[PDB]
């Protein structure tokens, strides 16, 4: 019926660091169905998911075939 208390998490990351990618990957959300106090959680859970896809993608970018075969030319 209920859950666990939410963390404190001081600081807004979008308002200080603006040169991050996936910035047009953010506005495909609804706003007239839910108020702002629950859309804050619907946005926070989305941003961790977005950077989780991004960091997972660069992880498998590293850890696919880890060295380079064509590097032996130089």
């Amino acid at each position: 019926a209920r859950r666990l208390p939410k963390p404190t998490l001081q600081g807004r990351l979008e308002a200080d660091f603006p040169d991050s990618p996936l910035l047009p990957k953010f506005q495909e959300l609804n706003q007239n169905n839910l108020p702002n106090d629950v859309f804050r959680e619907a946005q926070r859970s989305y941003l961790v998911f977005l950077t989780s896809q991004f960091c997972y993608e660069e992880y498998v970018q590293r850890t696919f075939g880890v060295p380079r075969r064509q590097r032996a030319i130089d």
Partner: protein, 49 residues
């Protein structure tokens, strides 16, 4: 012997083998073992075949 540095024979002896080999079976075989045999002393392991 199908690995990178032991096949070229112009990559020299007294260097690391972990940096310049590809991600073959020798690569993850040498990760969990974690030893650093240089190139050239792996060449006679190739040469015994």
């Amino acid at each position: 012997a199908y690995n990178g540095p032991a096949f070229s024979h112009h990559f020299t002896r007294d260097e690391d083998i972990l940096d310049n080999l590809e991600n073959g079976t020798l690569r993850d075989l040498l990760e969990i073992s974690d030893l650093r045999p240089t190139v050239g002393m792996i060449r006679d392991l190739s040469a015994s075949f």
